[PDB]
Amino acid sequence: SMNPPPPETSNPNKPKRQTNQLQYLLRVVLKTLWKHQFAWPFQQPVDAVKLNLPDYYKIIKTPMDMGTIKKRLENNYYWNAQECIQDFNTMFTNCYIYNKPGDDIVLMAEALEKLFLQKINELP
């Protein structure tokens, strides 16, 4: 039932880059998912305590969320767009691993993932 430390959004010895694809990821891909009606459960690390998911971090070993991704993009944390896309991917996959098909949270993820894949297709 306890919360690990959240994923790092800074790392001084990690090599950083600003690519036009990273800037799109923040301006278009994240900005869009963030405003969606189903974004709220993914805007911060899962709080296993408040949300009574005491098995969450017993099951999910690579947690990720949009609050973390957003800060990482804001902190120029990534080397390339693929690293960032990978964090979105981890976020979705965790949801599908942890919860059951037909859970409301799964239908939420599923709608953001459809939207995500549509906005990523238009990646410059």
Ligand X SMILES: COc1ccccc1S(=O)(=O)Nc1ccc2c(c1)CN(C)C(=O)N2
What is the DSSP secondary structure assignment for residue 112, as one 8-state letter?
Answer: H
Query: CB of 15: closest distance to Na ion in angstroms?
Result: 6
How many residues appear in the chain? Answer: 124
For residues 68 and 73, what is the distance between their CA atoms, to the nearest angstrom?
A: 9
Selected range binding ligand X among 7-15, 16-24, 45-53, 67-75, rule: CB under 6 A: 45-53
Residues 68-97 binding ligand X (CB under 6 A) are 95
- Contacts with Na ion by CB under 5 A lie at 16
**Residue 58's binding partner out of Na ion, ligand X, none, with CB under 5 to 8 Å set by partner kind:** none
DSSP per-residue string spanning 36-97? STT-GGGSS---TTTTT-TTHHHH-SS---HHHHHHHHHTT--SSHHHHHHHHHHHHHHHHH
> Cβ closer to Na ion: 16 or 114?
16
Rule CB under 6 A: choose which of 32, 41, 71, 90 binds ligand X: 41
Q: Where on the chain is the footprint of ligand X (CB under 6 A)? A: 41-42, 46, 51, 53, 95, 98-99, 104-105, 108
